[model samples]
Target: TLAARIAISNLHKQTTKQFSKVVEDLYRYVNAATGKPAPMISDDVYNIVMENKDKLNSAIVYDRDFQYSYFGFKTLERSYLLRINGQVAERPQHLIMRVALGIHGRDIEAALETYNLMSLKYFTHASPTLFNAGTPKPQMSSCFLVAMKEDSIEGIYDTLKECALISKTAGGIGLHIHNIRSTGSYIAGTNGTSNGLIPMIRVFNNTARYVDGAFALYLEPWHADIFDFIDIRKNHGKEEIRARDLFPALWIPDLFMKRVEENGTWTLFSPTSAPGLSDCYGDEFEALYTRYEKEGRGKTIKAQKLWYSILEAQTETGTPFVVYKDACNRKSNQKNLGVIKSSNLCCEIVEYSAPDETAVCNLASVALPAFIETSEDGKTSTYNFKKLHEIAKVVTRNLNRVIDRNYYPVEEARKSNMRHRPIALGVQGLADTFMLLRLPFDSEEARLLNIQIFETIYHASMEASCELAQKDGPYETFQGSPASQGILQFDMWDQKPYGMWDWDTLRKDIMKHGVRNSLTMAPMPTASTSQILGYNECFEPVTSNMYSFQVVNPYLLRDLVDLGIWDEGMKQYLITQNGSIQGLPNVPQELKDLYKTVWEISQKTIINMAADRSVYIDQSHSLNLFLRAPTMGKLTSMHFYGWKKGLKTGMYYLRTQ
Candidate 1:
């Protein structure tokens, strides 16, 4: 309540209560930020707000500011609230109004409608919306998932350029390099054995280090270089072999997990020598993998050896994220395209990529806790799905507009964005929502809410797309899409929805008019965006009651310390307890329950919630599996379950303590 009061008061101080004045201020500030010596608010938006100034001003209800939790408001103050020379210049209402004008420009009715709906907390724009709503260089996207085009120098460098360009525009990346040949594999051009993924990744490590923002690298476990791959991110590995600067992930096939569980041997092979290993899934992959082993064409090792290496790395360095391959492939709507090689940085976005086509996703995340409402009794509350649905529509419209306004650095990216028009609408602060409602992280009610929340987002986003198509006549590549054939994301998963919305009518609308976007609803990791909003990252539970966020260097690990309420010794003890505050003295139970990290929660529950939401998400999610002590047995079981459940991105990355 104190935080909310501070935030609301801060907002009131920064923005004028008058809607016309707010737009005028944004117009001036955006141009000033760009050093253009002139205002930049679109003439359309300016005109509308001016014409409807009285109505617009009267319609705005500042009391809505009180609805945001302390953390949620802090998130806004820290990032989304517009600032000038290090001080926030715009209020929460100002930011929303700014986004409204940015989107509806000159359409007074539309802008006011957007502001009213968004301010009421029905649905909110993605991170980019908050970050760049009235700014000069508004690259308000959250993630960009990509795949390495090839293994050659040209391919690697080209992919690097793509990553650099994307980063320059503020898009987080998830790139996969599974097709690259393994160590000792023959290279036709050089007539020599390849040095494998580690060396190539060194260049990528440097790229990640040199690059300004987030990048996560993805690889499958079946590659012959699995052993070396597992060791690359450990704190104690050889510097040449270590690519600690880059985030690493494991793309687990169901067969590999099955081999480990059955106490069987696992075969590893190079993509160059074995061929087609990454192109197939389920029985086809298993058959080809076993056939190659029988042919004695590659190396064979104890499955547990590879498993132990992963565990050891996790214990020492806390990375090399684990993602289930078969599950991701089986569950994806893009299965019609081909095999999906990897995810974006933060392991939340799952999309399709090929040599000719690099997968691209533009992303946004809703502030989930904003949707919670208190009952008269003050002990109970309800989620405002109707409001969320309205905001989802606005987000869909904004993302489509971005497709046109976005400055793509590469022709391929432009081509992909124009033709496919994929957008990711994710959420942040599920744990915060649980905390406010007083629900345990692993509680059944929480789980059910997770499913329903995503369901609402998906449904609302789809409805908005359908409406966009009604006006714009569908996206360019709308024909032959699954939605075109009346198949939704859940239908692909063979799952049924809770029927909270009208699926039948939506399907009819989509088939008749077509939808404006190819893909929607990708849950990405909201790292910086969440920080700005002061919420937990995406759907994750809190990692610790008190943990250090090093704020020294803008880029690398340089000078930051713990900011937890606990002392350093107590902090160490909490980490030793795997991020749980339950056993520690002087800690309150409420804090302990609210701060249970991913490791403390059941891995099964995490996977299940991801699977449940997968039905609604058109693309895959950055699902980082966490374990205190990961074993081949445990990892294998988890991988198989995801594969069996049919996910597009089995795993994005695996993190361990």
Candidate 2:
């Protein structure tokens, strides 16, 4: 006990020390004999720091670094914090300040504000932003979408080069090869029958692996090699046929699902024979597809047969993410831009990408638990929507700034980002928020709150974007867009937004000023950043309670402590229950309900929550559906439910127990 107290005191002393000492420490660590070992901070960053030393140092709240849990701190140390000559050079506060400076540049006030908000965990920029901000090559965009430039060797390699460059800078890619010719398609240049996507995909898979990056391959099911594409991720596929390292996703049209439902047949064709299939959506797509079918282009199969293949693939590998093409186009503000080819790596980004323009989305997620406020005695808690809105506006402004300030990995990405000016503001810790408020994971209270929360952020983001547009101008391509026509995301979805925010006023303001960003609100899968912020993944319920140490889940441990029932025996019992408290005799039903893991929660409830939030989320959500047991019929029903709900992304991953 004495040692622990002294250790705590020593830690407090280290953090509470003056900012000047911290700078000197940085100086000492970097400069061996007033001769530096290496340059950790970029020259530009250093110069800015030198110029604003007094102001920035005074603004730095060093002790705020202590707010991060030990695991969070370690995650930051492992991947985020900058190192010089393989030695850590920056403290957590220093890293925050660097990120702030990196984003805001010479505007010290804005920098400090961003630093303060981020330090307090109000929100966090995506991992790429954190990784390269303030560095020389600050390619801070998290997601990139590049459709195949053309159906030729030149087009293929050029797109591959772009992907390689983007991946080299730590940006995740979404590539659509929908236009690539099938296996037997003739190659005009070489006068030979071409090899299909398998060999080419292997090259991309190796590129991603060698570059130590990630990519999601997008293909419409109409491709003649669609079966091969779906099977590439199977465990037992031959090495020549498998590219399991790459994530495979299907950009499925509504007609396909209708056929599946009707037990009709599906025709598959090489793009050479049936062109323009991936270039359009809705009735136009249906007309062209049916026309191609009447002309007898490609082979046919029962739609259920293809559907069963997809189900089996998901059951075995939990992948081949399915997105609805018609829903994406139908509910898109970017519809006027063009038909969006595919979603980004996580399936949250839905922007138009073409040969000339590669779509880019810079992401930032608000920490939902930060909005929870406890009563004086700490017995009751309420969510602070006003505060959440205020922070969301700030996040929107910051993300808009990121679009302009970002270092583009390719000219196409730069062109698309600058022209459309899209940004994504997502959230983390919805599960945590529900638990803190003593609401069940599937409670109506939680459902209403979830919808309201998205409404607030969307309203706030639009307002902020409009305010920015009033000062400057709307995005370059904003005139013909849906927002310009006085339509919002909810309007596009044909859903009326609730009364949480004054949508009437905001809609009018947007029409007048036209808003700064073309698209907003993509709830991404916060795999790493959530861990760093000590929250559940984006908008997902807890999957399990037994993750390690003394007590696996921190929230469960804290609740058990408050109930005065935490013990070795209790922990053992929880372990025996596989981290479930549902069957525990002493645990109150309320507590058990509050802590219900994703397995116990109904998938229907999950889909409902997703649909509720979808009205406000213009882009989409990286929604992963979980099942305790897997089956063909259940998977089919769940997918159909989400599709009928008009979700742009029907499912990102099909999770199974």
Candidate 3:
């Protein structure tokens, strides 16, 4: 409460506090180094904030600031608050107001509504929004995926320049390399053989290190250099071959899975020869690949060899993140735009990318712990699905507004974002939420809560986007789309919703008004953002109940103290057992179940939960599987299970105990 008060009060002094003067100050100010005037807030945005500064300021509930925990307040101070001479120039309330006004422009009522919800901690915008909300150049989208322009040196270098530009403005990227020719493949321009992926990738590795943002390099499993691709990030690899700075991911085709299942042969292809394989899906992909095999245009080997090699790479190094390419394209709302090549740096966002259009994702995360409602007696708590649903709708509206007012770093990004308008609304603190309600991680109640929470978000976001459509019309490419045909995400998976929401009404409304955004509901990893809110990261089960440094997480420590189990003995005991509660004698069984780390819980249960939620996730998710020691059989089984369970993204990172 003290932290929150300081954070809120700091805003009272940071700017002029008239709100109008701050806008005027920032807009008219000159940069000392540049000597010429530099504007933090745009001219039009300045007018909007100044016009109704009084109402916006009056709407702020100063006492609400105390709701933020100490750690959360510090996090806001560290990043979210705007700084001018490096002394923390704005406060939490100021940021919320700035973000709201930045998005809604002259629509003061809408801006105030957004401000109130955000200040109340129902939902917060992506880091980009918080970083440049009221600034002169607000590039308020988190992730982008760039398509490799071509297989030539010129194309590769041009793509790198594009990536460098995007990274400067804070967009982490994913780009495909399936089209690049294999090692020893002929280069038509020079009449020389290609140096292949490694040398080019090393350049990208250096670029990712030098650039402000990071990048993920994606390749299809069938590339001839698959062996080298999987081994690039491992520690013991040759120095010349290693590219530790780049995140690697496999854009896997179903045919590869089928071959591995049957222990049959898998052929490696250079996209230069197998022209249509990367471009098509399902039967079309199968036909082109098989035809390439018949023509002897590929290198063939035992499928399990590459499969085991991939497992070894992941066991050694936590990547390459895995995604089922067929499922990604098949289930995408952007399917009309052509095959999506890859996901962003984190494998949380899967969207269409083409030579001319770079896919962009504007992100936001809902605070899951905010919805736990305790009774008047401070017992008999419940997960308030109703409030969660309302917050989801509000978050959807806020994200849609961001897309409209957002600054695009590249023209292709602007083109894609304008055409599709995708938004990712994830969650933070699911484990903490369950702890509040006294439900074990794998309990039936916890499972039900999981299904209901995602379902509510899916329904609420659609409703809110559809409401926007009532005025703005649908996104640019709405006609002939699946949603245009009255087919929602659940419909794509051949599943029906549980009717917790008015699906029928929402569906009818969507058909009539259309939806403003093309794709919604991707769950990104909310690490720093969740820390600012003092919550567990993004629906992830706890990795440890107690960290190596004790009492560092004030929220967890406070809760443990309340439960009367936060003693020195308990701390030493956790350190001894490495933080697993399975064998602790004094810790109660309920606490044991509630605090079980990712290592203790069966990841099979986690994978199923991912499948349960995927029907609502139009984009994909960043999912990790944990094992103390991963064997080829165990890894293969897990991949096959998630595949058969209809997961578009089978894995993100593998963590071993």
Candidate 4:
């Protein structure tokens, strides 16, 4: 597979190991009409490349190009490879060396170590890094969360400016507005009634369109006009009233969930009358919310009534991504920095965001399939945990380095990043790893391996961060952290760390020197990154055994074709069943088991696995529940189950058959 790209790469001698020459050529290219030279690489980066060209060239192995599958090669070609004058200007080896040296400037040994691993396909930095790293202005982080600066006209406009700049430079925005007042609420400054989140967020909607940057709006369910906010993104709504371009999500709390579970009444209130509602969590939040409710300060309705509205909106729009509040703050090491308001655009990286400080996380995802151990005959006998642990440490170090090297668009982001340094390291091809080991999708062995893999990653990441602390001091905000108190993530959940790694010695080391980061090991969705690696996305089960382009079940398809058993009729039949072989007449039991789609597996199992891994994670996981023809009963059960299990993110999106 990768061999295809490797072979094609050899044909492109126009590209060379001459990094300095390529930079010079790009820098000297002149615009035909303007008569001015255009430069792709920055002057500073160019000088460094020229100085270290021989060392970088000597470290790379062009033959490793053969390792990418055909799909991976095409993905890199179509989107990843940089262009000069509208022609492909980079090769696989060049991009690899570029990212490494981009991260580790002046540290040649570290750069070579990073290059050899990524060049060997061990792991990949997230999309933004691959896109902007080694460029003139390298803003190489992925997710950033923005809190509303204040609840006034001046504050709203200033926050909008920050959002625009970040989008121009880095990733999408997860902005919260629960601090803003509701409709008809009094604005003492103007002695006028407020027009609510509608008019205010409408300005944000226009800015998102004008800047062409993506953003998701976050609100607490307790907000009085949440029902109105839910309608903002619908396909059919008054143009003047709708903010259709932006994404909306609910920041849910435990009491609301418990109310929904009991099918009890729920109330809605404005933050103007409900001060501190968005700033506190756990019992304190519950006490304040109920005190407001008992004082007749809000509108009341059946919790089921509100539930139906959420369901109807989801059925039509596929959003308001659901994230549980108490779970996120309860387990956070950054709880010292007040409450964490919300997550980023795609619903990962749960960290604290205050008025003056926004949260930032640099991301990387591990290739789980890289750990599969094979025999001479090409059968996977076991997974190599030792190799996986080593790679996790390397990736942890890489992302930590990204924090210091990154170019921040605003002072708020720089302040937050420096105070409590956070990084997100996720997974890709976990399902591929399971299949390679010949384990069924929901088998016990696969489940055990799933937890063990995360456990290994957590241990390795903390081990690396603590080692960094031994050299430099711990992060600025590490003094009062849970890790500083020697209470690790697993301890917070009252769960024991698995025995494979030495926890006792690691704990002693952490207690002595502390750790370099406030948070580590957050698993992201890995949608684009996974494609480039030619693997399934994140920690998800296989969605289907077939695709529009080709069959996912290559081995079974080969058998069917070689035995002269496949046909147009069977192809049509497979589509009718939606990629399930459970009842296929000629399909063997073993092939059927191997080809089971996620819809066929128990969702209970999926939740169990997420709960299993969350103990090791300092940040949250993006969990999705899929049910074909989802009923009211099925949807409610899954949400309640995940909530009671103490999951930080209850659901990302709801997808139906």
Candidate 5:
């Protein structure tokens, strides 16, 4: 407690005694981690902060840090409160002030205005911005991933360098090397046979370990090296070949599941030999892949071996995030771009990338906990859908501004960003909202609320984009775009939208004037943001209230029983049932429904909800499918359901326990 107090006090002292100084210090990063000299605050920002510094400083009330619950403050202290050389440089108030300055800058009036609101916890930025704002080498991006340029030494190393640069800037990455030739493949340049993907991945594994940021390696289920690729991450795999440092994922094509269902033979081919397979999807991919099989140009194996290996990995390591390829491409507005190869590290972002263009998305999540409230009579509670819609609009405007204000790391990033203008507005308190509202996770009310919540977000985001278009005009490539012709996201699905919002009116405005942004509304995995806000993961029920979270000095098992959140018997029952509260006695049905972990909820429900909002979402969502015991049947059914639902990205990743 004293350490926390001291940390808080030191932060307060280091921050400005006056809000003006706080703004100034943040604008001037004298000590930066990057050796290259640069201003911590931009000149435009400095001018804005200087003009209103006094008003802003005075407007900021520094006492809010005490309002943070012990765990809540600690969460902020751990990752959000500004740190310098491993020591916190700014207080909670200072961090708020910094963000205010970061966004509104020298316009002291607006700076203080934003500061007062943020200090009161009205809204917050995503974790990366909270972590690295006002710092040198502020790679305040949440996630980044790459596809290996080629199988050659040059391409692999070049990708490694890109990873290091992004990692140094504090970005998480997802990379696919599925195109790399298989083991013992010919290497004509050196006249030596290649060692295949395992050894090459080992090098990348070490690179990931040494790179100091999160990385997930992605491969398609049909890769010629799928077996060896799956084995490299197993606990008992050959040490030299194993690259346990990197996270693994299967970028699944629908055909693979089809083969598994029919017990059909599977073929694996190298990108070098197969050519266009990696670049196509839907009917085109199926036809080419099947043609390759008929032509007898690739290796064949029992579909069961690949299926079993997936299970074995899930049983052992819990990962190699499973994402559906055909569904991702089919449901994507970005489908017009190219076939999407892989997701970001967390398996939420599914976007297309070519050799020359690297896909990038700026992200922010609303703190759903802040919106939870009880009725005045204290008898019932419900989600504030109207407030959520307003916030979604605000978040859209903020993210669009971030794209303009962002410090691009590379020219290609700037080019792609300005051209595509994509932003992700996600949430982190769906389960918390359900619990607060006394709704069960799988109840009809909960299900409707899920659909309604996303629908509201999609509608609000589109409305804001239309307004932005009215002002600054739509994104450069708005012409011939889906939104330009009044074909909203839902229109693509051929699903009629509920009458919650006037889609007819929005469509008229959009056709009259295009939207400012290209893509909006991706439900990213709110990992650190959720933790900071003390909520469950985005749109997920509580896995277990009593689970282990790594802290500074020790591993702590937080038991819900100790917090009076649950009782001993119930905890034991839940543990016995493998963390599901569905079958437990003594637990209220409402709580049980509210806390139905992903495994307890039907995967069909999950897919349907995604499809429900897909009309509102121009870009794809990072949809995670959960299973207690995943079988070929379950995976097949879930994928087909999403496909039939006309989803753009059927599944971003599959989670099993």
Candidate 6:
């Protein structure tokens, strides 16, 4: 199987031999009349390659091309590699080199370092970065968050066009509609009442489909139309009220949770009737909402009525992702910028987006299992934290360079990206690391390693950003932010230092020169990128022991082989158990513990691990919940527990048996 994957990569390399030819074949074609290179690929990228041919060619190590699995290589050839008239024109090594040159430009040393580390599987840029990195139109950022500019037809249409442009470049979108007025609200311009979020949402749905885009629509719970909003994603909803193509999310404030817990009534308002509710949070928001209620500004209903609607919707749709508004704002570095209204499509990113400034974030992930060092005897093992720290710093500087080199899809996106300059660092293969160390998902060793891994990454990323600030000066809006006052992400969370890094000195260094990026750590879902690396998703427990029609969990397969128990019968047994090893009659307890699937483990441990790591995560995680047989009470308990634990994103998707 490994030979087949390597052969595939080699065959691709044979067909497209020279990097210079790739540039010419892909980008050198000229328009019939203009006599200029086709706009599909960048001339700047072309000239850089044509100019430094020998140096760039010498840097590529084709031996490293065989690291990817068969499926992973096929994924790249199908979607990631640059193609010319439907023929693949870049090999796996060529693609990595392209991305390095794309980001580093004329900085030959940095480019070579990035290329070597990426090829060695120490880390990888996100899917969007991998797809368009070296091309003409390099819209490399992964996530975008936009606030509704206004409630009028003009504002709505303009925002719609912006979404179309972003979707064209394949960027995932998160748009908040908290200010849009509800049904029966007066429209002074037309003397007509509004048709509500459903009709407007229908238009967005069709637009995303037409453009082949991903959009997650975010709404605050207090909006009068929220009852209708939660129902949009359900299976049996009326067609007129449904917009299933778009994702539904709740931007929930603490007051609503308090009301639900206390069995008190909650008020709903059309933003037209009650204006400042979505703009503030915590006591200020609570005071404004109560003041509006006393003045008879909106209708009142039992908070549980709305709460039950959310739970029912989740049971059926597994979405309407719950993100705590107060927790997000209370523990954000962007707090000084503005109140953060919504997280991105996967709910891992929390940033402030305004009418003028649309939020953007670039993403990259470290391959966690690659850092493990095993002895020649296969008995002793150690984690290379020192090497991990070194590579993470390189990734940070690479992402910072991406901000200045990125091709933005919209003017507002560019405006925000250039001004604030935020980037995310996530990880893959955490479960692999746990198994390599022979630690169970719920074991004390696994939990502690998880915390330390994230702590080390945050430390390195902050150090790199601070170093960049010393050279290039801090980002334009770095002042008035939390980091400007010697407060780090852990400080905002009231978390103390883990003592592994020199925290005291790092803080003083940050004080002398503010960090280059506004926000640093956000662990994304890594849906496609992780697939390319053949690893489990970001910091998540493994969901199955088999993938792609084989006993694909490498660790489990290795143990099975070493025990002299590998055969067709054992494979059948594993399949019958739904890829679980615990119930196998012959498997050892140690192997079972090391290879427990997500379904076999407790969801509480998953959430706790997320919270434990959240101390170092300045942004959020794409946290999912799993239950064999879920009940309304179970769902309710889970959400409330996560909220009280102070996780910014309580849930992304709820997986049920």
Which structure is stronger by TM-score: 2 or 6?
6
lDDT of 1 at 43: 55
C-alpha positional error of residue 559 in candidate 2 after TM-score superposition, expressed in Å: 2.7
- How large is the C-alpha RMSD of every model relative to the true structure? 6.5, 2.7, 2.3, 2.3, 4.5, 1.9
Weakest lDDT window of 10 consecutive positions for candidate 3:
548-557
Q: Can you write out model 4's per-residue Cα lDDT over 282-349, one digit (the tens) per residue?
A: 99999999999999989999988888888777767777788988888888888877899998888878
- Highest TM-score: give the candidate number: 6
By lDDT, is 1 or 4 better? 4
Please identify model 6 stretches exceeding 4 Å from their true place. Answer: 2-10, 29-40, 375-378
lDDT of 3 by residue, 328-424 (tens): 8888887877877888788889888887789998899999988888746755887788899898888888788788788888888989888888888
lDDT of 2 by residue, 335-369 (tens): 88888999998999999999999999889999999
The prediction achieving the highest lDDT against the true structure is: 6
Clashes of each: 32, 0, 1, 7, 17, 1
Name the runs in model 1 displaced over 4 angstroms: 1-88, 120-123, 134-136, 287-291, 371-380, 435-438, 528-536, 542-600, 624-657
For all predicted structures, in order, the TM-scores are: 0.81, 0.95, 0.95, 0.95, 0.87, 0.97
Instruction: For model 4, give the 10-residue run with minimal summed lDDT.
Output: 2-11
| Model 5, span 203-315: residue lDDT tens | 76676677566667888887887887776657766656676467777877878877877887898887777877778887888899888889888899989788878766755
RMSD of 3: 2.3
lDDT of 1 at 569: 70
Whole-model lDDT for model 6 versus the true structure?
Answer: 0.87
3 against 6, candidate with superior lDDT: 6
Error of 3 at 209 (Å): 3.7
Model 1: residue 411 alpha-carbon error in angstroms: 2.5
Q: Cα lDDT of all candidates, in order? A: 0.72, 0.85, 0.82, 0.82, 0.69, 0.87
Model 3: lDDT of residue 456: 95
